[PDB]
Design a protein around this ligand. Structure first.
Ligand SMILES: [Zn+2]
Lengths: 148, 92
DNA sequence: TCGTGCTGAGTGATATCTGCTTTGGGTGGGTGGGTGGGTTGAGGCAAT
DNA sequence: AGCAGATATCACTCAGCACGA
């Protein structure tokens, strides 16, 4: 009746494959191999990789909304919405069974008390001096930090 | 091309409706000689308004009243029901 | 003067289709403004 | 994609008459 993420009270993270363990079992550890910002290309998208560099900027901790809870003035029921994007369109009209049945036009109002939020921080990582080629300018890559 | 919701005789006669009013309307309503007249009027209107809301959320109270009026004037089944009620009470 | 349809066209109303425009950046302009943002670098000028 | 204006097709109210009571 409610999204699974709403009641979750934990965060999940992946620890890269240690080089020692990979070499013990005769395997290559792509995830734990350090890379520069330049070496991160478009073919690496969607993979678990490691980046080596110097942090140049960290933003303030802000709440990022994941599940939004609404209320019906007429119905008396609660609605939920899942956010997985930069932007979202708020609900305006009730979708409950009661409302629908009865034909009652009830407006939805946002409720921040019952919503789910996660701490968000945006950081910038820049190339080290020894990683830049000859006659090149350093590059930076954005970092998104969520949870604990 | 969408059927409108109406306070039909069917509705009125359901378990949530007139039978509901008869079953539990003396317990909740109480006119007190020690209370102000406005308070008694508000209590009666409170009970009937909550019942109406439960029954037929679309309309307001006054609107509900009006609708009730028209339904009662028009519907022949409702008339039967009412008469039945009255008859059964007169037989007691 | 109540009840029950049959007629009815009027007075709605609400469920239902037809056209912008936007972000921001010169792939809309300077007869939309510079107090709605951009905006660091070079250049010419007056007071110094 | 979202929003504001508009068209047109959807019902509902007061209107009034025939039968009989
Ligand atoms: Zn509702």
């Amino acid at each position: 009746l409610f999204p699974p993420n709403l009641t979750r009270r934990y965060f999940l993270y992946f620890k890269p494959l240690s080089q020692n363990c990979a070499r013990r079992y005769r395997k290559k550890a792509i995830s734990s191999k350090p890379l520069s910002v330049r070496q991160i290309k478009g073919d690496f998208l969607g993979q678990l990789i490691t980046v080596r560099g110097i942090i140049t900027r960290v933003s303030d901790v802000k709440p990022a909304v994941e599940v939004i809870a609404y209320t019906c003035d007429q119905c008396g029921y609660e609605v939920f919405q899942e956010v997985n994007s930069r932007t979202f369109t708020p609900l305006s009209e009730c979708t409950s069974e009661e409302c629908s049945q009865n034909q009652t036009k009830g407006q939805l109002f946002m409720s921040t008390r019952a919503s789910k939020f996660s701490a968000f921080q945006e950081c910038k990582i820049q190339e080290l001096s020894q990683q830049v080629p000859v006659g090149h300018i350093p590059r930076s890559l954005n970092i998104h930090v969520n949870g604990t | 091309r969408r059927p409108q919701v109406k306070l039909t005789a069917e509705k009125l006669l359901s378990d949530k409706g007139l039978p509901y009013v008869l079953k539990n309307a003396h317990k909740r309503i109480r006119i007190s000689s020690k209370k102000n007249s406005y308070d008694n009027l508000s209590n009666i209107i409170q009970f009937y308004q909550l019942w109406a809301h439960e029954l037929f959320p679309k309309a307001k109270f006054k609107d509900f009243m009006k609708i009730c009026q028209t339904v009662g004037k028009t519907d022949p089944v409702l008339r039967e029901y009412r008469v039945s009620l009255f008859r059964d009470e007169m037989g007691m």
